[PDB]
Design a protein around this nucleic acid. Structure first.
Length: 535
DNA sequence: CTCTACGGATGCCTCACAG
DNA sequence: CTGTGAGGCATCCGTAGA
């Protein structure tokens, strides 16, 4: 009860008709799907291969009943032909299987990524193999209206060109040094036992459960732990613990807790998710499961940035990491405010600027603490917080001893004013980025309206940089390793180091050039043998 | 508007057991 | 012969802890 091609040819050793390859002559695109025996590319086999050519029954290669390599020759040609688009559903899975089975492939259109982009993160056997192979032709036709027709053109085309870089990143993985891992685990464990012993001595109770909040609270009350104001401790929250630093017990307790979360929540949890036959971890990246459109990962961005932890990630033998970052990509995206644009054009830092406005100092007299405070003020107020919320956010995440009257002065102290007033007045629910990626709110939130275009444009820029990088790296067999925040990490042989550095820089600069017309980005790049070298 | 893990705390649910 | 405290886990839940 539809118009999806449901007839098919079946290819085996007994009926192989060479003339079938004449269907491949002068085609531009075709729907491609496969059927496998399971989910693990290393443990499973390809049961079927489906190729749907327009107006023809699907050519189905029965791989469990094919043993002459010649039968797949014309197939390999289609796969190798850089001028034939392969339309696929779940392109990573099929490409993974084809690569593991020594098939080369290039030019892919994954209809699932495009459909997920039509959704804008709103979250609203042979006959089957034939209809699923041939439906791709019509998805290709319609989803490619939703290329050039839509202005969602830009993002749909770029994510679609980004399909291959994402497969590259997940398939290359990143190698883990288990030595330093278990080592640091034993270290933090010995520090934890030192904490436990020295604190149960400090708690005047050797049998108290240091992991039981009630027992620790009772011991502290018994120990009569009081602050400078002689007030007995009432709760064990770290914020309250900050008020009792005059006692060595709060010292040791906060220490043991920090080391405990570090050890159990990380040193003890991390080994539970690793691959073995390759000693590589292959995490799962979600493309469109965040509100902004940034990448997410599961089973890398929640990994601590401290060099103590990031030193565990190393390149393969004879290779080296190349790490690149955008310098303040979000704020430049926001600028793209007259004062702000002129400052950016004079290469004046936005946080130094805000520090000079709050403190009334001149830019040469602004110190790092001034810039840190200005950073917190900028991220809090630019994204729509009020001074009460600002005080709490600042003290919580930046550890600042500001007063309510101060944050209120900060709040009260032309482009940004106009844009904020426009957002307040319109109270709109639909917003878009410079790629014209779009979102519709369930209700109006000033702060989410301010936050969405910046992060979504950052996502667009990084993804286009990954697309250019993936195309530019083939010549030197470059490997895409990682993308976090506004930074990318690649792994390359050491002899192409500086060349890949330029490729990476030009991959990111051209991407920035596609979106920013009034401001120039800055790329910080380093050559490293570990991920901790950047820090 | 949360989420996650974690132990401690509830909270019934059910089975061997001694009267 | 048969209700029953006990135990015996089995999860659910609070709050950190983000």
């Amino acid at each position: 009860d539809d118009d999806i091609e449901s007839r098919f040819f079946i290819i085996n050793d007994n009926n192989y008709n060479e003339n079938i390859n004449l269907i491949y002559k002068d085609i531009k695109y075709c729907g491609l799907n496969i059927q496998t025996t399971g989910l693990e590319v290393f443990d499973e086999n390809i049961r079927l291969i489906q190729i749907a050519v327009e107006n023809y029954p699907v050519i189905i290669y029965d791989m469990f009943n094919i043993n002459k390599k010649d039968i797949l020759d014309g197939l390999r040609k289609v796969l190798e032909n850089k001028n034939i688009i392969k339309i696929i559903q779940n392109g990573k899975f099929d490409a993974k299987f084809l690569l593991h089975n020594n098939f080369k492939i290039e030019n892919i259109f994954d209809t699932y990524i495009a459909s997920k982009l039509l959704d804008k993160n709103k979250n609203m056997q042979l006959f089957y193999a034939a209809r699923d192979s041939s439906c791709l032709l019509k998805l290709y036709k319609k989803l490619k209206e939703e290329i050039k027709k839509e202005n969602l053109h830009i993002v749909n085309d770029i994510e679609n060109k980004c399909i291959l870089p994402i497969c590259d990143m997940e398939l290359n993985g990143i190698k883990v040094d288990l030595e330093n891992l278990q080592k640091s685990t034993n270290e933090i464990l010995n520090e934890l036992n030192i904490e436990k012993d020295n604190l149960k001595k400090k708690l005047k109770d050797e049998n108290i459960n240091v992991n039981s909040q009630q027992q620790v609270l009772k011991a502290l009350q018994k120990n009569n732990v009081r602050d400078i104001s002689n007030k007995l401790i009432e709760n064990t929250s770290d914020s309250n613990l900050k008020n009792f630093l005059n006692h060595e017990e709060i010292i040791s307790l906060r220490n043991y807790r920090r080391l405990y979360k570090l050890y159990s929540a990380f040193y003890l949890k991390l080994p539970l998710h690793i691959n073995t036959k390759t000693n590589k971890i292959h995490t799962t990246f979600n493309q469109l499961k965040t509100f902004s459109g940034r990448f997410s990962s599961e089973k890398l961005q929640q990994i601590p940035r401290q060099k103590n932890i990031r030193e565990i990630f190393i390149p393969n033998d004879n290779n080296i990491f190349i790490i690149a970052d955008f310098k303040q990509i979000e704020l430049k995206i926001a600028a793209e405010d007259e004062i702000m644009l002129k400052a950016y054009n004079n290469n004046i830092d936005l946080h130094t600027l805000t520090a000079s406005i709050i403190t009334k100092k001149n830019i040469p007299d602004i110190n790092k603490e001034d810039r840190h405070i200005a950073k917190a003020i900028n991220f809090g107020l630019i994204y729509g917080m009020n001074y009460v919320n600002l005080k709490n956010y600042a003290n919580t995440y930046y550890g600042l001893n500001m007063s309510l009257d101060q944050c209120l002065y900060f709040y009260n102290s032309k482009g940004i004013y106009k844009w904020h007033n426009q957002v307040k007045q319109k109270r709109a629910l639909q917003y878009s980025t410079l790629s014209n990626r779009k979102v519709i709110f369930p209700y109006f939130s000033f702060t989410k309206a301010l936050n969405y275009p910046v992060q979504g444009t950052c996502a667009d820029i990084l993804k286009l940089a990954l697309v250019d990088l993936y195309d530019n790296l083939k010549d030197i067999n470059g490997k895409i390793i990682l993308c976090v925040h506004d930074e990318i990490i690649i792994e390359v042989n050491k002899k192409f180091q500086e060349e890949a550095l330029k490729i990476l820089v030009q991959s990111m600069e051209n991407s920035a050039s596609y979106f920013l017309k009034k401001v120039k980005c800055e790329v910080s790049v380093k050559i490293a043998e570990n991920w901790g070298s950047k820090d």
